[model samples]
Target: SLEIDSLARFAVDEHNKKQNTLLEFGKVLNAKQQVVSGTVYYITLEVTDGGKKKVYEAKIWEKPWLNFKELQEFKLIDDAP
Candidate 1:
C-alpha cells in the first residue's frame, strides 16, 4: 500500500531543492522517507540522478504511518488504512 499524503509532502520538499541535473533528480527520487524526515517527522524528498550532468526534477510526499514496509523482502503485518 502507498500513502498519498506522505508522497505529496515528499514532492514539495524535493521541489524546493531546485535540482538541475538528471542524476541529481534521480538520486533524490530514490531516497527513502526515513532519510528525509526532519525533527518533526515531516516528509521530505530530494530529486537527483546518477550522472555528471543532466536535467530533471523531483517531487516528494509525507503523511501518517500506513502499511509501509521497509523493503519488499519483509512481510506486511498490517494493511493500509
Candidate 2:
C-alpha cells in the first residue's frame, strides 16, 4: 500500500520539474479543482506491476489544447499512455 507521504513526495517531485509559468501543484489544484494547466503541459502516468511492487510511469502528452473533465477522462480514453 502507498502511504500519503510517499504519494505527496512523488507529486511534489513531479511538480518541481514543470516548466512554462506561475503555477505550482497548489494553483493547478485550486483553479481547476484538479490538475489543469494552461502554462505547464500535460502529463500521463501508467501503473503496472514490477516484481514485488507496482511501478509508475510518467509522461507528458504533446497536445496543449486537450482538456480532460475528470481523472476518469484520461482512464476512459485509449489515447493516453
Candidate 3:
C-alpha cells in the first residue's frame, strides 16, 4: 500500500514533466502489480489539474534491478468515482 502510493505520485509527477502540464498528486484510487519480463504496474491515481480533480490510469513498467522506471500510459477516466 505504501509503495504503490509512491508509484501513483510518481505517475503524476512524470506525466506532468513530460506533458508540460501541472497536475497535483492526490491519492491512489486503485492499483495492481504484476511481474512480467519486468515489473508491471497498473495504477489508477487521483490528481488535480487546475481546479478539477480527476482519476487517471497509468501503465508503469519498471526494472528495479536496473533502476529503470517508465510511465507507459496515463489517461484520464471520464467517469471515475
Candidate 4:
C-alpha cells in the first residue's frame, strides 16, 4: 500500500526547494499509480496548487527497497477560473 500523504509531502518539499516558495498541496483532485518491477511504484497527482488554487500535476516514484520516494516532476496543468 502506498502512502498518498507521504507522496504529497515529497511533492510539496520539492516544489518549495525548486521555487524557493511554499506551496502546499491544498486538495487532491485525482491520482494515478502504477507498479514497476513488481514492487517499485510511480504516481501522478492532480492537486490544488496551494494558495494559488491552480491545478498542477505532480509526478513521483517510490522504491520501497531503498525506503525512498521523491517528486520527479511538477507542472501547471490548468488555469481555469
**Number of clashes recorded per candidate:** 29, 0, 0, 0
The CA lDDT at 38 in model 3 is: 74
**Which window of 10 residues has the lowest lDDT sum in candidate 3?**
72-81
Q: What's model 3's TM-score? A: 0.50
Q: Model 1, residue 16: displacement in angstroms?
A: 0.6
Candidate with top lDDT is: 3
Q: Which lDDT tens digits does candidate 1 get at residues 1-81?
A: 146556656666676666643332222234344445422222223333463333322232333365332311222223321
List, residue by residue over 1-81, the lDDT tens digit for candidate 2. Answer: 235445655666766667434443332222122564543334444444443333233333343466533322233223324
RMSD (Cα, Å) of candidate 3?
18.3
Cα lDDT tens digits, model 4, 1-81, are: 247867887888998999899786765667888876514334444455455545566766776777787766776667653
User: Which regions of candidate 2 are displaced past 4 Å?
Assistant: 20-81
Q: Write the per-residue lDDT of candidate 3 for residues 1-81, one digit (tens) a residue.
A: 898898888889899989999999888877777777779899988887677678888999998899899999998776445
Q: Can you give the lDDT of residue 79 in candidate 3?
A: 44
Model 2 TM-score, all chains together: 0.21
lDDT of each: 0.38, 0.42, 0.85, 0.67
Question: In candidate 4, which residue ranges exceed 4 Å CA deviation?
Answer: 38-81
Worst 10 residues of 4 by lDDT: 37-46
RMSD of 1: 21.0
Better of 2 and 3 by lDDT: 3
Q: What value does the lDDT take at residue 25 in candidate 2?
A: 39
Which predicted model would earn the best TM-score? 3
